[PDB]
């Protein structure tokens, strides 16, 4: 009927020193990347009958969650944004300066608002079934307070109809912004594959 997926552009990510992507044994998606690096994202979807000719928009959020507040709740909670640290905020030269992340090389027109949480909204057109763009993180795990460092950061996207109703969603279950993405990615893969 209808589905949506978010993934990194594998071709480029495949052997990059700056980022790495993997799937868990449970098929959830994991991304590790350095801050200040362009991560190539591709959002794809298939729509049902009633939306075939709909004008749609795509919302992009970057939130945190833990065992106490699950992913489905967190991604739609306007108060769950991952917060940029003080020093990266004031040192920021991309507007809005306090956003943890930015969208570049977007094939689609986009706008930004923090009203209901830091969100980039891609304006699309009837018939669009994919959205390509780079996302770049301007703060990192190392910057956060121990309690926040323990929470999981999540990149979530929502496909909305003309009336603003979410009709599909997808996310990268865990995103980590670290110094050596290949170290963490490798440890993750070995631990997963060890699982008989
Ligand atoms: Zn920072």
UniProtKB/Swiss-Prot annotation:
GO terms for cellular component: germ cell nucleus; nucleolus; nucleoplasm; nucleus; transcription repressor complex. Phosphorylated in response to IR-induced DNA damage which is thought to be mediated by akt-1. The chain holds residues 223 to 418 of 644 of the full protein. Keywords: Activator, Apoptosis, DNA-binding, Metal-binding, Nucleus, Transcription, Transcription regulation, Tumor suppressor, Zinc. GO terms for biological process: determination of adult lifespan; intrinsic apoptotic signaling pathway by p53 class mediator; intrinsic apoptotic signaling pathway in response to DNA damage; intrinsic apoptotic signaling pathway in response to DNA damage by p53 class mediator; meiotic chromosome segregation; positive regulation of transcription by RNA polymerase II; regulation of DNA-templated transcription; response to hypoxia. Transcriptional activator that binds the same DNA consensus sequence as p53. Has a role in normal development to ensure proper meiotic chromosome segregation. Promotes apoptosis under conditions of cellular and genotoxic stress in response to DNA damage, hypoxia, or starvation. Regulates germline apoptosis in response to DNA damage. Its pro-apoptotic activity is inhibited when bound to ape-1 in vitro. Plays a role in cell cycle arrest in the germline in response to DNA damage by UV-C light. It comes from Caenorhabditis elegans. Belongs to the p53 family. Residues 1-196 bind DNA. Its main location: nucleus. Coiled coil: none annotated. It is found in: Nucleus. Induction: By DNA damage. Zn(2+) binds at residues 85, 88, 139, 143. The keyword Transmembrane helix does not apply. GO terms for molecular function: DNA binding; DNA-binding transcription factor activity; protein homodimerization activity; sequence-specific DNA binding; zinc ion binding. Expressed in pharyngeal muscle and neurons. Homodimer. Interacts (via C-terminus domain) with prmt-5; not methylated by prmt-5. Interacts with cbp-1 (via HAT domain); cep-1 transcriptional activity may be inhibited by interaction with methylated cbp-1. Component of a complex that contains prmt-5 and cbp-1. Interacts with ape-1; the interaction inhibits pro-apoptotic activity of cep-1. This is Transcription factor cep-1. Disruption phenotype: Reduced numbers of germ cell corpses, hypersensitive to the lethal effects of hypoxia, increase in production of males (Him phenotype), decreased lifespan and in extreme cases embryonic lethality. In cep-1 and prmt-5 double mutants, germline cell death and up-regulation of egl-1 mRNA induced by gamma irradiation is prevented. Double RNAi-mediated knockdown together with ape-1 abrogates the increased number of apoptotic germ cells in the ape-1 knockdown model. The gene is cep-1. The keyword Transcription regulation applies. It comes from the Eukaryota.
């Amino acid at each position: 009927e209808k589905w949506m997926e978010i993934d990194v552009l594998k071709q480029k990510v495949a052997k990059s020193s700056d980022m790495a992507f993997a799937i868990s044994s449970e098929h959830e998606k994991y991304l590790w990347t350095k801050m200040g690096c362009l991560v190539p994202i591709q959002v794809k979807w298939k729509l049902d009958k009633r939306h075939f000719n709909s004008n749609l928009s795509l919302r992009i959020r970057f939130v945190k969650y833990d065992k106490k507040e699950n992913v489905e709740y967190a991604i739609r909670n306007p108060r769950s944004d991952v917060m940029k640290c003080r020093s990266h905020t004031e040192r920021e030269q991309h507007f809005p300066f306090d956003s943890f992340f930015y969208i570049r090389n977007s094939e689609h027109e986009f706008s930004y608002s923090a009203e209901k949480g830091s969100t980039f909204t891609l304006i699309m057109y009837p018939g669009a079934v994919q959205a390509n763009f780079d996302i770049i993180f301007m703060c990192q795990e190392k910057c956060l307070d121990l309690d926040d460092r323990r929470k999981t950061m999540c990149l979530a996207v929502f496909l909305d109809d003309e009336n603003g109703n979410e009709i599909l969603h997808a996310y990268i279950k865990q995103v980590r912004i670290v110094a050596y993405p290949r170290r963490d990615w490798k440890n993750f893969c070995e631990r997963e594959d060890a699982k008989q």
